[PDB]
Design an enzyme around this catalytic site. Structure first.
Site, PDB file in Angstrom:
ATOM      1  N   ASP A 101      -0.137  -7.702   1.832  1.00  0.00           N
ATOM      2  CA  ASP A 101       0.400  -6.302   1.749  1.00  0.00           C
ATOM      3  C   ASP A 101       1.911  -6.294   1.893  1.00  0.00           C
ATOM      4  O   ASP A 101       2.434  -6.014   2.948  1.00  0.00           O
ATOM      5  CB  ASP A 101      -0.239  -5.451   2.864  1.00  0.00           C
ATOM      6  N   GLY A 131       2.562   6.495   8.231  1.00  0.00           N
ATOM      7  CA  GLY A 131       3.980   7.025   8.105  1.00  0.00           C
ATOM      8  C   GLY A 131       4.974   5.945   8.471  1.00  0.00           C
ATOM      9  O   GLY A 131       6.095   5.939   8.025  1.00  0.00           O
ATOM     10  N   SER A 139       4.089   2.842   8.031  1.00  0.00           N
ATOM     11  CA  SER A 139       3.656   1.893   6.934  1.00  0.00           C
ATOM     12  C   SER A 139       4.833   1.317   6.176  1.00  0.00           C
ATOM     13  O   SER A 139       5.678   2.097   5.782  1.00  0.00           O
ATOM     14  CB  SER A 139       2.824   2.610   5.890  1.00  0.00           C
ATOM     15  N   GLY A 140       4.857   0.019   6.001  1.00  0.00           N
ATOM     16  CA  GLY A 140       5.976  -0.621   5.247  1.00  0.00           C
ATOM     17  C   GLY A 140       7.186  -0.926   6.099  1.00  0.00           C
ATOM     18  O   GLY A 140       8.032  -1.697   5.694  1.00  0.00           O
ATOM     19  N   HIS A 185       0.841  -1.243   0.000  1.00  0.00           N
ATOM     20  CA  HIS A 185       0.000   0.000   0.000  1.00  0.00           C
ATOM     21  C   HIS A 185       0.851   1.257   0.000  1.00  0.00           C
ATOM     22  O   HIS A 185       0.331   2.358  -0.037  1.00  0.00           O
ATOM     23  CB  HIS A 185      -1.011  -0.024   1.222  1.00  0.00           C
TER      24      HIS A 185
END
Ligand SMILES: NC(=[NH2+])c1ccc2nc(C(=O)c3nc4ccc(C(N)=[NH2+])cc4[nH]3)[nH]c2c1
Ligand SMILES: [Ca+2]
Ligand SMILES: [Mg+2]
Ligand SMILES: [Zn+2]
Ligand SMILES: [Zn+2]
Ligand SMILES: [Zn+2]
Length: 223
Positions: A84, A175, A177-178, A40
């Site tokens: 994801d 923020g 994220s990942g 995402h």
């Protein structure tokens, strides 16, 4: 990261910042030419920034490298966020040193109860917005799949796990994220989603990396 602490410059040497003119997601370095992040967080025009602590100040230990290719998981579902995960290849190999290091992929999946380290430059307020410039850390345990599924009924698949505190207060957030969820020296998760940040009974949901190791190894060897 809400309710965490300042990590310390370069104390998470495998943490990467994905930049497209500004920082928008985190990622993990798995070897000198590859980074794993969340699907995402996909964008065209990503520059990977390694050895970062303050993302607004060049402190001397950074390496800024553009991505040559991004590969989102073949079965990523943007509506449910199932699978994801995404791989990013660097245009040039990174120079590994004390401040820039890769993290190991897991040999098996981790147990509920295991303590992990989550890090990122994401929002630090549950009800509000405050983005930090230096890296924040959070130690959190993996929760049981039943508390994870009771918090999110019909939304958790076998490719996700929850980590955090049901009392609320500490969580990863937009923020982050990942970014990495490291447990016992292995990359076990990727910051994926949640309901708001740090709300009671709404823990964070992470991509369960142990389910993708063969896909990761096969994909980087053929690209
Ligand atoms: N490129 C974009 N426009 C973009 C990138 C990342 C995003 N992330 C969210 C997000 O909405 C979101 N990412 C989360 C990660 C963890 C938790 C959590 N509470 N643990 C909640 C999150 N919410 N929107 C996003 C939009
Ligand atoms: Ca910097
Ligand atoms: Mg992060
Ligand atoms: Zn958002
Ligand atoms: Zn969100
Ligand atoms: Zn996100």
């Amino acid at each position: 990261i809400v309710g965490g602490y300042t990590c310390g410059a370069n104390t998470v040497p495998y943490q990467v910042s994905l930049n497209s003119g500004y920082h928008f997601c985190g990622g993990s370095l798995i070897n000198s030419q590859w980074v794993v992040s969340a699907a995402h967080c996909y964008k065209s025009g990503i520059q990977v920034r390694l050895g970062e602590d303050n993302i607004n100040v060049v402190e001397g230990n950074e390496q800024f490298i553009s991505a040559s290719k991004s590969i989102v998981h073949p079965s990523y579902n943007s509506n449910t966020l199932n699978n994801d995960i995404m791989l990013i290849k660097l245009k040039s190999a990174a120079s590994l040193n004390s401040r820039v290091a890769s993290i190991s992929l897991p040999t098996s999946c981790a147990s509920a109860g295991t303590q992990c380290l989550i890090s990122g430059w994401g929002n630090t307020k549950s009800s509000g917005t405050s983005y930090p410039d230096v890296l924040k850390c959070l130690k959190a345990p993996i929760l049981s799949d039943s508390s994870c599924k009771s918090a999110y009924p019909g939304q958790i698949t076998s490719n996700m796990f929850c980590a955090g505190y049901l009392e609320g207060g500490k969580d990863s957030c937009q923020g982050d994220s990942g970014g990495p969820v490291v447990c016992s020296g292995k990359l076990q998760g990727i910051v994926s989603w949640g309901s708001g940040c740090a709300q009671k009974n709404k823990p964070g949901v992470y991509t369960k990396v142990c389910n993708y190791v063969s896909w990761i190894k096969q994909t980087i060897a053929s690209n």
